[PDB]
């Protein structure tokens, strides 16, 4: 169960459900929801939460 | 009532303070906060709220 996605933009949470992203954070994406929020594990911070879909790219 | 910004990505609110964006929505940007959330008026919908700063680009006109 390794990285599915990589953060490409800085995201600072405003809401308690959100996942903080730094550029190049490795992400394990558990759910790509119909409202364009991704539920993920940040593999750098160990935090879980949601972020806006366009903040990450799919990795090989 | 002049547009400052344009939505470039679909943004569906999860929170009541958030602004729904469709791609190309004209935006009047009222506040660019230190945490990279923008407060805007959506000029298509008439809604107000906040969205993640990378979801919009500045229009130079």
Residue numbers in the entry:
A (entry chain BBB): 489 to 548
B (entry chain AAA): 489 to 549
Copy text from the publication.
Aromatic residues cluster in the core of folded proteins, where they stabilize the structure through multiple interactions.
The PCA suggests that a staggered conformation in group 2 is favoured over an eclipsed conformationin group 1 when residues with larger side chains are found in position 541, when isoleucine or leucine are occupying position 517 and when smaller residues are found in position 493. Of note, three mutants (H493A, V517A and A541L) induce a staggered conformation of Y526, with χ2 dihedral angles ranging from −41° to −75°, whereas V517L shows an eclipsed conformation of Y526 and an almost identical structure to the wild-type protein. The high resolution of these structures, ranging from 1.4 to 1.9 Å, allows unambiguous determination of the conformation of Y526 and the surrounding residues, as demonstrated by their unbiased electron density maps.
